[PDB]
Design a protein around this ligand. Structure first.
Ligand SMILES: CC(=O)NN1C(=O)N[C@@]2(O[C@H](CO)[C@@H](O)[C@H](O)[C@H]2O)C1=O
Ligand SMILES: CC(=O)NN1C(=O)N[C@@]2(O[C@H](CO)[C@@H](O)[C@H](O)[C@H]2O)C1=O
Ligand SMILES: *Cc1c(COP(=O)(O)O)cnc(C)c1O
Ligand SMILES: *Cc1c(COP(=O)(O)O)cnc(C)c1O
Lengths: 830, 830
């Protein structure tokens, strides 16, 4: 059937009876009233059963051996569905497929019932998910720590071409994967005030919110290792949240509990954008405070909570603990670790600081200013008074370091301060992270250089040793084996299976680049993938596409820097040329654009309306026929990505050079047989560098060109004046060609494009359509297109998160990865 | 060990492995980190497993056979713990005891970990719970329908002698008994307006709240029948509760969902008291609306949703459906059933009314005015506009009936109206229930007569056939076998086990009233019970009592009509007499008073303070010694009741004649070997009548005396003037003898007692202490005390809820009870 494992005689039988056990005992249903949803749960529970054994021995193991622990703090974990992934990592896929088949059910139909764990916005969140899978696969004693939002990223609905947001109640029917652990609930403080008494400061009169943990298993790939992702939930204490007496109402007091519990209710839907709301800040301290207590408790037991030097010496803390900050969201971990060490454990400042810096590491994910976290001092002042004091003190000592290093450089001092003066005083969380971490890293080579040359230049000069780079990656498991079994199979037919946990081995595929059978196969799976997607489209969304055309897709969050607008310009261009010479041949294309817009991002929502507007016109022009279709992919999410990417021919990664830190969708497309048209931005550089620029469609300005243009000054009128095709499009928008009933509908877009385009869309237009013409040319030659594809796939190995994690492990965490199978799952009950 | 069933070889082994299965697979724990709480859950899950099989066949059965269905609507279901009860009803107690023993655990210690299902306030709620158990035991196709509050009755804490309320988070660690059924979620409407168009009215522009059901199994006693208790939970729709667009905030919209969900958040903590809050009304319509849809859906399938006359003829509705209104809380069911039938199903008014009246029955539980539900019209007008219109129409036609029956009786008309004029117009829900039900019943013989003679006199004259009586009862299972296995065993040693489901058989115990062994035994278990309670006291609450003294206990909600104050007066009297003649012998007593006070009931909270105040004085007077102890039982609840009642010697049921509708705690004490000192109130009358007045300690005014006094006019001064002992107590309170630091602390109590005692406490004082002297006398003669006890126990049979239910079934529901074992639980998988 494929190498989804063995469909053993004993195990298929075993599976079936346990499926029935759960349907009866767990779901309390009988075959006569069971629905597909019930069947999905029975299976999920059956599958989950297989990894609890491993989960328990894994955790027990780490307790015995006591290795250094890696704590990945992130406010986002974009998990997606977990049934299939679990089957894949446990080699249960074929057996489950067989068993369910024998039970007269279609496993695939059941898999579609699982709701996505959308606890993330996009890149940053998905990265964390890929990392977890890699850390488990590499045998690291790692823990993912975050917030259990009961409402993840909103579900996107298109009404009249506009985006409509609606709550994502992903827990509505329950989550069979998580395990509530109310017995490990912890208290988290807010507000209050600071008392300075005799031997130390005291955080007093605080409001208490409780943090209840929920553990979700994270299985490594076929190595019997199952790590843990701990998500915190906010709960109100039953005392003060009722006991602070003297009138108010008993009922009201109870109803008001949903005020402390609002902390974990919903994820903020922003991308590369910072919103300074109090609820956000609360979420940030909540996950940090709870997590740290858990970390220290585990440390206090270790082998120190037995003997060792005997005396809670935190000197070994860094040798046993490593906490990675996914961006600045969990940045309060730094001053919080200090608070605990100094205020509670009573360590001297300097010893505490040494420990803190030595255990913390910070990862930066962007360089655009509006994304940078700068919290107003009055907010920190009210909500976390002691943390502010600690920050000021950290700042004080850091600046003194600077002054001593750069005597007299007074401007440098203000530039480097963690405190920003002006309208309102703010705290620069990024500066905080740099100062309190022993390593700072970018997510792509160019992005990392930009940090050193630009944004954090002063810090780099101060401590050059801190700055590193760790190019992002993706998990071959979910992003290949899971979503594209067809491709994985044919690759395995030639080079084996070892590449799934050693993606570098894909290079061996280079020697089949001239293989006639392989070329035919690679081309076949892609055709099968396109057919399946084209079907799904009519199935769940309804209104036909042509599977023979070129599948041109751009899927990612909607943003000005991502330039979906540039994609738009090209689409309109294709349309106008066809209308000009109707009876001239052109390579057919289905351009698919999908992505979510943050609710408050007006422009982004305007662009979504533009895309659908273009489709309204283009898709109903008889002269166009089936040569050009514009489709907006609704509710783009992980599960949807697993469907489009394998069916994509052309991948669009066209952000303005210097704006996309790295990107990861680009890597997803490369490993799945799509060709890339993009700019020298983020990881695109490393990808083209790995496959060879001849096998990549690069175009547009490089970072240097962008800066040159800025010196000069960007004037869009120029481009408008010299390119008639561009002018024609702009006047079509301006006159209502795409919005008849509301002719001025797109005035904001045009206005922006002509007068305040921060991402110089026009500057890259000419080179973009020219480049687009080259891909159309190559598509006309199936054999050569496919051969170029094989060159990309065979050369994507470097982009697996296993590689990324191995680097973090060795160069930052100080731990050694291991592909050693944990001692089976085998029963055991001590 | 006892007749808690057989500890079979095969089953104890089977139990043990499943206990381990759950500990591992369900709790995901290993023996090395498992805590008593974990062990409790493993067991609960193991036990629950045994009744899912029966649960499924029971429900399937009713579907096949299709009998008349009984729907018990109540806003309260005081369930308590359910682990033991389930073991008892399934004959699993000894086997589980053995198995856990072999696993090296103490079952009793684990049982104490289970949280109480406190979804009730007191009598009314517990009645519903006893009823459910009886309906299952009698094989009735019955369903308990209510609201799943996430916060039940508050947990009571005594601080400085005052009551402190704190949220009852009973779901904190999960509820292994319930089964969420999100697939059966239903919509419930609120607000909106009424449109009158061509063919009918339309309830329009309503706000939608969703009702998610949660099913809990209700096992009959050893008959393999497992009925269902369906509790509704409020959930917000993800559309409009987000989709009603045009600014507000996406985050805020999501956080505001906890506004529609507040409907099922907390139970109102009132007793015999009506609070006209909107949230209450919402809760009332919520349970009614959701339940009815479920009822009709089930009806539409039946055997009509196949064939029958073919044409949704609701003429058979009453032959297939019976809905019992537990008080007026679910009274909206009447106008709602009309709305659906008329507005949606399109039946003519008259045919709809005939059906409604024929399927509804109303149970009244009190006669005090402040407890009567009278909803302001402006509230119904805003929240349920169409229901108001229907009510007005019902009223219109009903009054026309009256006018025709009593021509010219204009005052009768206003008296009988469902609409009350005055300050604000209100709707008399009780009048509504009488008009729309075919039967109205009281809960005790005297209470039922009072209804006919007083409160509902006019209605009785109009339709004498509607009024009936159904004396309350209690379940011998929980209230005997479960809480007093010792007593149940010795009874069984003589007369067998058949009495557990046929309590009348207890009469046979009469022939052992002179049996020397029995007398010794009955006396022994009570001594053992007292020792165990005396221990528990020091264990969990701490500060000694004497097990040889007379256990004088009064446990029930704190209320003025319950007269805990009268009990107080007596206690102080005993104290004063001892202080007068220290070296005179008196029978030692431990008087225990426990009960919760509604948060807003100032007087009731003042009484709690008085009781603790008396104990402060009495318990620390050296001259008193161990002859008199005053203890306030904290957080009185079902699980606590199961502990005190079996250890009680004297039961206090001293409400002012005519105020306690029935009472059920009184019955609990009688069946557990306690003697009763009380007034001729509620079921006390029937109890004394059943055991013989010679075996009961009756005292005080009868109903007639109370009325005589009211004609005359009640003047407490008189009693104060003629009884020196009474005067002495009042001046002690007034002068601060019991409250030194705050001398005027009890001015409200004294003031009330002297000037506004609605329950003439003083009028019954003399006859009360005199009577108390007679019980002390009899306690001095162990052999005769015990013989009187045997007379009560042997004669309590009539007070089992099986009897009550059998009567409801035959005289109101029109169904025949059956003690037929359902065809085993045996596997089966169709
Ligand atoms: C999470 C999100 O929507 N935005 N988002 C960021 O703010 N930073 C992002 O991080 C990812 C992962 O490191 C980068 O690949 C991406 O280029 C960067 O924009 C990213 O995707
Ligand atoms: C529920 C509650 O606390 N109060 N409460 C009532 O309002 N009515 C009550 O109903 C029960 C059960 O029918 C009666 O026995 C009791 O006498 C009556 O007061 C009762 O106990
Ligand atoms: C991989 C992924 C992303 C990242 O896409 P980019 O093109 O790097 O912005 C975002 N959303 C989902 C659903 C993803 O799978
Ligand atoms: C039985 C019971 C009641 C009823 O007691 P009464 O004396 O009838 O008011 C109230 N609360 C609990 C906990 C009960 O068990």
């Amino acid at each position: 059937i494929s190498v989804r494992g063995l469909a053993g005689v004993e195990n298929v039988t075993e599976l079936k009876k346990n499926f029935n056990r759960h349907l009866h005992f767990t779901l309390v249903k009988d075959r006569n009233v069971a629905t597909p949803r019930d069947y999905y749960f029975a299976l999920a529970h059956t599958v989950r059963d297989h990894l609890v054994g491993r989960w328990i021995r894994t955790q027990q193991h780490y307790y015995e051996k006591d290795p250094k622990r890696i704590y990945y703090l992130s406010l986002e974990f974009y998990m997606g569905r977990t049934l299939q992934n679990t089957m894949v990592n446990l080699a249960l896929e074929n057996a489950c497929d067989e068993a369910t088949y024998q039970l007269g059910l279609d496993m695939e139909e059941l898999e579609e019932i699982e709701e996505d764990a959308g606890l993330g916005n996009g890149g940053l969140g998905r990265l964390a998910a890929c990392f977890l899978d890699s850390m488990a696969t590499l045998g690291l004693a790692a823990y993912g720590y975050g917030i259990r939002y009961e409402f993840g990223i909103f579900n996107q609905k298109i009404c009249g071409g506009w985006q409509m947001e609606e709550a994502d109640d992903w827990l509505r029917y329950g989550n069979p994967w998580e395990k509530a652990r109310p017995e490990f609930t912890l208290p988290v403080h807010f507000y209050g005030r600071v008392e300075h008494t005799s031997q130390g400061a005291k955080w007093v009169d605080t409001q208490v919110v409780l943090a209840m943990p929920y553990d979700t298993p994270v299985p490594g790939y076929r190595n019997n290792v199952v790590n843990t992702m701990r998500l915190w939930s906010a709960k109100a204490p039953n005392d003060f949240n009722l006991k602070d007496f003297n009138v108010g109402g008993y009922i009201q007091a109870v109803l008001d509990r949903n005020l402390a519990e609002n902390i974990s209710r919903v994820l903020y839907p922003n991308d590369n954008f910072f919103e300074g709301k109090e609820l956000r800040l609360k979420q940030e301290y909540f996950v940090v405070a709870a997590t740290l207590q858990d970390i220290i408790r585990r440390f206090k037991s270790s082998k120190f909570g037995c003997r060792d030097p005997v005396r809670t010496n935190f000197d070994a803390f860094p040798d046993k603990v490593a906490i990675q900050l996914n961006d600045t969201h969990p940045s309060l971990a730094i001053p919080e670790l200090m608070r605990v060490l100094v205020d509670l454990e009573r360590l001297d400042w300097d010893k505490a600081w040494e420990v803190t810096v030595k255990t913390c590491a910070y990862t930066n994910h962007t360089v655009i200013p509006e994304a940078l976290e700068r919290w107003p001092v009055h907010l920190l002042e009210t909500l976390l008074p002691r943390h502010l004091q600690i920050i000021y003190e950290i700042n004080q000592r850091f600046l003194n370091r600077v002054a001593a290093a750069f005597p007299g450089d007074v401007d440098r001092l203000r530039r480097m301060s963690l405190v920003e003066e002006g309208a309102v005083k703010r705290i620069n969380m990024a500066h905080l992270c740099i100062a309190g971490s022993h390593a700072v890293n970018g997510v792509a080579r160019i992005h990392s250089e930009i940090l050193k040359k630009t944004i954090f230049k002063d810090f780099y000069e101060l401590e050059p040793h801190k700055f590193q780079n760790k190019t992002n990656g993706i998990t071959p498991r979910r992003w290949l084996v899971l979503c594209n079994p067809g491709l994985a199979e044919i690759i395995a037919e030639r080079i084996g299976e070892e590449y799934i946990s050693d993606l570098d081995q894909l290079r061996k595929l280079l020697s089949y680049v001239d293989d006639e059978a392989f070329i035919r196969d690679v081309a076949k799976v892609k055709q099968e993938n396109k057919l399946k997607f084209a079907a799904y489209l009519e199935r769940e969304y309804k209104v036909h596409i042509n599977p023979n055309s070129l599948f041109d897709v751009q899927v990612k969050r909607i943003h000005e820097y991502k330039r979906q607008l540039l994609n738009c310009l090209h689409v309109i261009t294709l349309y106008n040329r066809i209308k000009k010479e109707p009876n001239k041949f052109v390579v057919p294309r289905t351009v698919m654009i999908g992505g979510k817009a943050a609710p408050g991002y007006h422009m982004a929502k305007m662009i979504i309306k533009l895309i659908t507007a273009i489709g309204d016109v283009v898709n109903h022009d008889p002269v166009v026929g089936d040569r050009l279709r514009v489709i907006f992919l609704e509710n783009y999410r992980v599960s949807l990505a697993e469907k489009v990417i394998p069916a994509a021919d052309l991948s669009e990664q066209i952000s303005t050079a210097g704006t996309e830190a790295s990107g990861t969708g680009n890597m997803k497309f490369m490993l799945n047989g799509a060709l890339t048209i993009g700019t020298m931005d983020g990881a695109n550089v490393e990808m083209a560098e790995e496959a060879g620029e001849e096998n990549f469609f690069i175009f547009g300005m490089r970072v240097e060109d962008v800066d040159r243009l800025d010196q000069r000054g960007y004037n869009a009128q120029e481009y408008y004046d010299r390119i008639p095709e561009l002018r024609q499009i702009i006047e079509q928008l301006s006159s209502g060609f795409f919005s008849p009933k509301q002719p001025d509908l797109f005035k904001d877009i045009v206005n922006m494009l002509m007068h305040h385009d921060r991402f110089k869309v026009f500057a890259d237009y000419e080179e973009y359509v020219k480049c687009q013409e080259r891909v159309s040319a190559l598509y006309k030659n199936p054999r050569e297109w496919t051969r170029m594809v094989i060159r990309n796939i065979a050369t994507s190995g470097k982009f697996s998160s296993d590689r990324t994690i191995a680097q973090y492990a060795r160069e930052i965490w100080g731990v050694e990865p291991s592909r050693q199978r944990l001692p089976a799952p085998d029963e055991k009950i001590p």
